[PDB]
Amino acid sequence: TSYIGGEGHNLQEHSVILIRGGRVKDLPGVRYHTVRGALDCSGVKDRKQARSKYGVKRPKA
Amino acid sequence: MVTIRLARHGAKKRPFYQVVVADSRNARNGRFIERVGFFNPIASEKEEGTRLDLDRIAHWVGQGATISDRVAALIKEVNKAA
Amino acid sequence: KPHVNVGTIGHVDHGKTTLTAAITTVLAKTYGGAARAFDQIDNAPEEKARGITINTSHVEYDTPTRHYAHVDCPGHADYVKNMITGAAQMDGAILVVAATDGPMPQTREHILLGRQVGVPYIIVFLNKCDMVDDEELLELVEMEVRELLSQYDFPGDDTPIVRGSALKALEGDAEWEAKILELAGFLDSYIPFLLPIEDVFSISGRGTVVTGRVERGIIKVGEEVEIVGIKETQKSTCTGVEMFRKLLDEGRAGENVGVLLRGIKREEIERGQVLAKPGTIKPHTKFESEVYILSKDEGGRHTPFFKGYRPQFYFRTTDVTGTIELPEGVEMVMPGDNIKMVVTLIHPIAMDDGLRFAIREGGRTVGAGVVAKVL
Amino acid sequence: ARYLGPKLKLSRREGTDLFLKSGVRAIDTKCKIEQAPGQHGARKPRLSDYGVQLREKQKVRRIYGVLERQFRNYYKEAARLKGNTGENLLALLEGRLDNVVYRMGFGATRAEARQLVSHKAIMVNGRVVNIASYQVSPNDVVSIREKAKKQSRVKAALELAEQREKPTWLEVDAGKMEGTFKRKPERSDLSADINEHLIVELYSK
Amino acid sequence: NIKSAKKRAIQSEKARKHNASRRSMMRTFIKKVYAAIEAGDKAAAQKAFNEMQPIVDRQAAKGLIHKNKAARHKANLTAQINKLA
RNA sequence: GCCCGGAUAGCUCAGUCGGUAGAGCAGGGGAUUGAAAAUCCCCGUGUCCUUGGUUCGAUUCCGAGUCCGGGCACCA
RNA sequence: AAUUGAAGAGUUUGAUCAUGGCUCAGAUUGAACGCUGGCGGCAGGCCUAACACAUGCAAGUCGAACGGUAACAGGAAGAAGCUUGCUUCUUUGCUGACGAGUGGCGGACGGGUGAGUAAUGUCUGGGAAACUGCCUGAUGGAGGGGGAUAACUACUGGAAACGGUAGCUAAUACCGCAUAACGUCGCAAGACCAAAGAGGGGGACCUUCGGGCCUCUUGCCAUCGGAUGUGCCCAGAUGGGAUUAGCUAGUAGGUGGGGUAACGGCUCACCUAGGCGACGAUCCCUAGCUGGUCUGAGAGGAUGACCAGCCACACUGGAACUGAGACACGGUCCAGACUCCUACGGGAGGCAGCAGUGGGGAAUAUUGCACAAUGGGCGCAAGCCUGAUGCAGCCAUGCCGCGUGUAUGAAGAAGGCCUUCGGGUUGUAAAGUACUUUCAGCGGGGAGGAAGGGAGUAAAGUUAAUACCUUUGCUCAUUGACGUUACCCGCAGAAGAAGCACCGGCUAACUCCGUGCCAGCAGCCGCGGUAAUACGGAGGGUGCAAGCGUUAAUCGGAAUUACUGGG
Ligand SMILES: Nc1nc2c(ncn2[C@@H]2O[C@H](COP(=O)(O)OP(=O)(O)O)[C@@H](O)[C@H]2O)c(=O)[nH]1
Ligand SMILES: *C(=O)[C@@H](N)Cc1ccccc1
C-alpha cells in the first residue's frame, strides 16, 4: 500500500501509476510514494515552488 | 599460421595501429603473442610515429610467420639498410 | 505550396469526368505538369475507408498559383459515401450542369449534399454548350441553377459560372481551351502537409502503419512529421509509404497513402487524430465556432437546446463531443439558426479557423459548422 | 559555464573588493560594500566552522570564475603532485589562460579578459587558443592576433595595468602587446591574503 | 537450409556411404584374423596377418585413419599370434 | 471498429417496468476542558455521469458520447 | 620520478558518562522517473522473457582443377538490306569471361547470448603417456593403367518440396599396379605402405600436324623438425546452509582383452574389498570465471556492464557423419513443442548476427552508408564476398570542453517586497551608450586518414635467350564511406541559447501574508492546537549548472563481525 501525496489527487480504484520507495514514519506499514505526474496521476494544482516533485510543469505564462 | 599484422586502436577518426605478431585465425584486436612496435598513420611533425624492432620481426619471419602487406611496405619505408 | 481539394459534382453523365479530364490537360500543357488519361479517370481503383468500399480516382492539375488534388466518382452512390462518411471533402466544388438536361434531380441532390457537410463555395460549370447554341435557352439554364442555389442557401447571386464544352477541351480547340483557364482562374479567385487518421494498422513485424489520404502537400520516405492528437503532441518520422501493399517512394497530395511511423504503439494513436507539419499548428483547448442549424424535415432537431448541451462534433475523422457555451442574448436555440457558439472540447486537438464539419447528436446530422475564432 | 549574474553581489557576500569590477573607474564606493549580501544583511552571521571553511573556498571560485566540478577536477590535480597540496592548487589556478592575460594587463577584469580569449583574439606560440582552461607551460610567450589587435579593448585595458601590481613570475613587452610567461608562481607573491590552508581539508570529506 | 553450402550435405552423404564402406571391409579383415586366433591356428593367422597388413596400413596414407590408430592395430594383433606361437 | 456491465449525496446499496430520490456507515456544527475522550443539543451535505427524444410528467423508456473493467476482430 | 596518506553530527534521560542500535553529511551508477534544455568531443545505451518472431541482409570463392557455355560481349565463316562491305545476321566454345554441375578450400574464423555449471569450468604453477590443415626448414620422390558418376539428353512421379528409369564423357574426383627410405609393425631377420598434374614464353629439333621437347611459376607424396593451435593429468585457489551426516557397488585398485590421436573404469570379464567424509563428503539453494570496475588510508568489502582471454549454448532433448579441427548459430537424421504452405498423400522453418516487430518491463536507439581503411575467406594476381570492422543516425546516460557577452551605467527609476512608513532591498541589476563576437545559421576555400594496386619503361637475376617470370626505383591516370568533413576565411547582428534543489538543527542561506493538530511537510530529531524562519504562496538569499533533484543499488562513515582494529 502506498502514500498518495499532494493537495487533492485523482486516483479512483484503477488507473496505472508509478511507485517509488520511502517511508514516512507517520503511518504504520506504508513504505512508498505514488509519484504525482506519472502515467495517470496528474500534477497537483497551484504549486509554484519545488515542482520537480509533485510532477507540476513550469507555468507557461 | 602466424602473421605480423596490425591492430586498430585509438578512437573514432583517430587511429593508432599496433604492428603486432598474432595468429590469423583470431580477432583483429584479439589474442597476440607480442606487439613488435607501433605505428601512427595520423602522426605529425614530431620526432616519432613509427617503431619496429627488426630483430624480433626477423625472428618471427625466419620461423615461418607471414607478414602483412601493409607492414612489409612500411618496412621498405623504415628502410632496414638506410 | 498552398493546397485546396477540388471535385466535380452533379448529375451522372453531365460531363463530370471529362471536365476532370479537361482541367488536368489544360493545366499540364500551357503551364506544365503530369496529365491523366480519361479512361484512367473513368475507371477508379478501389479503396477501403472505415470499412466501406469506395472507388475514387485521384488525379491532379497544377495552377501557377494553386495546387489541386481532384476526386471523382462514376457512380452517384459512390459520391454519397464520399462527403458524409468523411472520405472526400472539397473546399470548392465544380458543379457540372449540362445545358441539355439543366438542373436535374441528381444535380439537385449534389446541391443538397453540399449543404449538410458544409461546402462554403460552389463553382458552377455549365457543360454541353456545344448543343444548345442559342442565347435564350442558355440563360434559362443559368437561372435554374441560381434558383437551386439560392433556395439551398448558397450565394448563387454572385457565383462565377463557366459556360463551356468539356469534350471540346479534350482535343485541344483554343476557343473552349482558354475557357477552362477561366474556370481554373475562377478556382483561384472565388475559392503545409496535413494528414487525417482514418485507420491504423500494426503491420506484423514492421510496426505501426497509419492510413489516410493526403490532405495537402507532398511527402517522401524519411521526413520528420509531427502528429497533433487528443493528447500531448509528439514527434516522429515517415520511414516508409506504401499503397495497398505496393511500394511508393513519395506520398503526394490526393493519393490515399499509408504512412509508417518510427516507433509508436497502437495505444498511442487513436483514429481521428492528425499528422500535421512540424511548425504550423498547435492544439487548442478553447475556440469559437460558427454553425448553421437544419430543420426537422431535413434531419436536424424539433426541440431546442440549452446551456451545457454537448453534441458530437464530426470534424473529418473525429467524434469528439464537447460542452458548448451559448452566446449572451439567446437562451433557447431553435432548429434553424445561423449563430456562433463557444466550444470547450473535452480533448485538445489542432483546431484552426476555417475547418468544416457536420454536427451529430444521438445518431442524426443536426447542423453544419466552421471554426470562427481560435482561443 | 559562467555565472553571468550580478558579479559584484558575491563580493558583498564576503565584503572584499575581489577586483570583479575594476574597469575604468578604479574606486567604486557606490555598491554598499560589506553591507549588502542579501535583504536582511544587517544581521551578523553565526559563522560555524563549516561556514568559515566554505567561504574561503567560495571566495576564490567567484574570483577565477570556475565551477565545482571544474574545481574538484583541479584539486585532484593538486593531490597527485609532490611538495605541498596547498601550493599545488594555487600554482595550477594561475595556469589559466584568462588569468595569464589578466595578469599581463591585457585584461581589465577577468570577465572581460575571458571574452578576448574565448573569441580567438589571444595567440600563444603563434597559435590561436580558444579554451580559457589552457594550462600554459613555463617559458612560453603569448601575443594578440593581428586582425584582432588594438581593437580598442586592449588599448584601454593596457593603461589600467598601470595602477596594478606588475608581478615577478611573468614578463610583458607592451611594445607590440606581447607577454611572456616564465616559471610557475610561488604563493608569497600572489595577493598575500588568500589562505589555501583552509581549502585542503574541505575536500577530504 | 537455403544456402549454397548445401553441396557439403550431398558431399558428405556421398562420402559417408564411401568411407564407411571402406571401414567395414577394413574391420572384417581384422575379424578374420581373430577367427584363427580363436581356433589357435598359428599358421592361418600369420597368413591372414600379411593378407591385410598392407590394407589397414593402406587407409593410413589415404587419410581415413589417424595413422597412429592403425599402427596400434599391427602391434597387439602380432602380440596375440606370438602368444600363440 | 463492434457488443454489454458499472456511472445513484464521502463511501456501499434500495427505489423503476414514468408521478417531484431513501437508508446504513458517515462526518460535522454548537455547550464543557489547557486540547479531546465522555454527555447533552441539531442535522442531507443529492447536477441519479452529462445530454436529447417519446412529454400534464423520465432515476427508471428509447437514444448517443465519455471514463473504467471485461470479450471479439482487422493487419499499409 | 613510480599508493604525501584515515574528520563528524542528531536521537534514549529531568540532567550525566558509557553500552548500543537507528539515521544523516560523501563517492559511485550499464540506470529509471520528474522538471528544464544551446551546441560540440569521446565512450556507452535489453540488466526483465534463454520470450515468440514478418521482411531485407549477415560466407562465399577459384576457369592458372574439369566437362562444358544456358546467357552477355568479340573473333571468324556465312548471309541479306541496299549507302557493294554502311549494316542486317544464321551457325560457331575458337578466345574474354560465365549461370548450373563435378572438385579443392572456407563453412569449426569472425559475431551474439549467460540458460546451464560449485567443478567435468576458470584462475595460478608445473607435467608427459599426444595430435597439429594453412606457413616455414632439411632430404628423396613425383613411373605406369582401369572402371564408374553429375552436368548434359530421352522418358517420367509429385501441388510444391523432391526424385526416379535406361544410356554419355573427363578431371589435382576414385580405385589397383610399380617403387621404396633415417617411415611404420617386430628383439632381429623380414614384411608392408605414397602420389597429380596444370599456367606462361620460346630456340635447334620435332609436328598420327592435339602436341612433344627445354625452361619459368605453382601444386602433389613421405619423413624428422619448428612455430602455432588443440586435447589430457596432478597440486593450490575459486559462494552460502549442518535446521543436509553418512555417501558409493563400474563405485577403490589390479590383470587381461578392446577402444581413444594419447594415459585412463574410457569401456568390458574376472579377483580382491576397499575408496570419499569434520582442514565439510553427499544433498539443497544460488551462480558463468578471471584480468578488472566502485568504494576504502590500507587491509579488506561489494561487484564481474563495455573491452580482452577462457568455458558453455545455439527452438527442446538426443545422436552421429564429414573433416586437420565440430560431435557444429546461417549443416544432416530422429522424437517433441510452436508456427506456415497445402492440390490434404506430404513437406517447410528457427533473429541468444546486424536492424526491426509483438509482448515483457520503471526503462535502453535505424528494417542507414561503404567495403576508402584494419583484419579474415578463396584466388598467381586482378578481384570478388565481408551487418567483422570502419562510419553515420537516435538519447543530457556518463566523463569533458564551450557559449548564453563585455565595459560603462545612480533619479541610485518603474514595479515587486519588507518597513519603527525615515527608509531599506531588488540594484550595476536594467534601461541608455560605446565595442567585440566562440559556437549556432548563410556563403566560398580546404587537410589528413592512401599504404598500394593497374598499365608502361629501364636495370639486375633466372635461361639457350635481349623472351617469360621475379625483384629495386621511376612516369601517367589515379582508388575516400564519412563529407553540406578537421581546420580556415568572409558576412550580418547581442542577435538564436537558464533553469533546478533548498533556507529549524544535522547543513552552507530569510521575512511577510494565508491556512489553523485543518491542509500538507518529513531522511532522522521532529513541525501544525489562530502570531509557523520546518505547511502553501510571494520577495530575498544560498547550493549547482545544461543539468538540478528523487528512488533503487554498493561501499564508506560502521572500531555496529574489530587480521590490521572490539568485547
Ligand atoms: N453533347 C455533349 N456531351 C457531353 C459534354 N460533356 C460530356 N458529355 C457526355 O457525357 C458523357 C459522360 O460524361 P462523364 O462526365 O464521363 O460521366 P460519368 O463518368 O459516367 O459520370 C460522355 O458520353 C460525353 O459524350 C458536352 O460538352 N457536350
Ligand atoms: C494501405 O494500403 C493504404 N495506403 C490504403 C488503404 C487500403 C485499404 C484499407 C486502408 C488503407
GROMACS .gro file of N, CA, C and O in nm, chain C residues 22 34 41 92 95 105 117 123 194 229 231 240 273-274 287 316 332 339 347:
model
   76
  165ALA      N    1  -1.051   1.754  -6.849
  165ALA     CA    2  -1.032   1.880  -6.920
  165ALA      C    3  -0.937   1.974  -6.845
  165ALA      O    4  -0.852   2.039  -6.906
  177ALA      N    5   0.190   1.678  -6.499
  177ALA     CA    6   0.156   1.546  -6.550
  177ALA      C    7   0.006   1.538  -6.579
  177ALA      O    8  -0.076   1.589  -6.502
  184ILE      N    9  -0.943   0.807  -6.545
  184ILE     CA   10  -1.028   0.880  -6.452
  184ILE      C   11  -1.167   0.817  -6.449
  184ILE      O   12  -1.235   0.820  -6.346
  235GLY      N   13  -1.399   2.377  -5.240
  235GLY     CA   14  -1.469   2.440  -5.351
  235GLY      C   15  -1.504   2.335  -5.456
  235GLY      O   16  -1.416   2.266  -5.506
  238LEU      N   17  -1.968   2.248  -5.986
  238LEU     CA   18  -2.100   2.196  -6.020
  238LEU      C   19  -2.117   2.178  -6.171
  238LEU      O   20  -2.133   2.275  -6.245
  248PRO      N   21  -3.261   1.632  -6.102
  248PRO     CA   22  -3.285   1.594  -5.962
  248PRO      C   23  -3.155   1.542  -5.899
  248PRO      O   24  -3.132   1.562  -5.779
  260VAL      N   25  -2.268   1.872  -4.533
  260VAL     CA   26  -2.128   1.861  -4.493
  260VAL      C   27  -2.061   1.997  -4.475
  260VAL      O   28  -1.961   2.009  -4.404
  266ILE      N   29  -1.846   2.640  -5.743
  266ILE     CA   30  -1.827   2.699  -5.874
  266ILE      C   31  -1.918   2.616  -5.965
  266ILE      O   32  -1.925   2.494  -5.950
  337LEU      N   33  -0.064   1.798  -4.420
  337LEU     CA   34  -0.160   1.758  -4.319
  337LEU      C   35  -0.220   1.623  -4.358
  337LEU      O   36  -0.243   1.597  -4.477
  372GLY      N   37  -0.262   1.519  -3.168
  372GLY     CA   38  -0.369   1.430  -3.128
  372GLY      C   39  -0.439   1.480  -3.003
  372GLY      O   40  -0.400   1.582  -2.946
  374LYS      N   41  -0.417   1.440  -2.715
  374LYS     CA   42  -0.321   1.407  -2.610
  374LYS      C   43  -0.209   1.508  -2.628
  374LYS      O   44  -0.224   1.605  -2.702
  383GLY      N   45   0.852   0.513  -4.427
  383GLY     CA   46   0.800   0.437  -4.540
  383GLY      C   47   0.658   0.469  -4.581
  383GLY      O   48   0.575   0.509  -4.498
  416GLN      N   49  -0.727   1.150  -3.496
  416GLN     CA   50  -0.621   1.249  -3.481
  416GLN      C   51  -0.564   1.290  -3.617
  416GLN      O   52  -0.614   1.248  -3.721
  417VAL      N   53  -0.460   1.372  -3.615
  417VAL     CA   54  -0.400   1.420  -3.740
  417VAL      C   55  -0.248   1.436  -3.739
  417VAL      O   56  -0.189   1.477  -3.639
  430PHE      N   57  -1.191   2.748  -2.829
  430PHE     CA   58  -1.209   2.815  -2.958
  430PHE      C   59  -1.356   2.846  -2.984
  430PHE      O   60  -1.445   2.793  -2.917
  459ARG      N   61  -1.407   1.581  -3.984
  459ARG     CA   62  -1.331   1.500  -4.080
  459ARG      C   63  -1.308   1.352  -4.050
  459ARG      O   64  -1.319   1.268  -4.140
  475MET      N   65  -3.284   2.988  -2.554
  475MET     CA   66  -3.323   2.866  -2.625
  475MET      C   67  -3.286   2.882  -2.772
  475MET      O   68  -3.317   2.984  -2.835
  482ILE      N   69  -2.617   3.112  -3.591
  482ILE     CA   70  -2.542   3.185  -3.490
  482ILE      C   71  -2.409   3.117  -3.457
  482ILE      O   72  -2.384   3.004  -3.497
  490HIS      N   73  -1.115   1.716  -2.526
  490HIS     CA   74  -0.977   1.678  -2.556
  490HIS      C   75  -0.919   1.766  -2.666
  490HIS      O   76  -0.966   1.764  -2.780
   0.00000   0.00000   0.00000
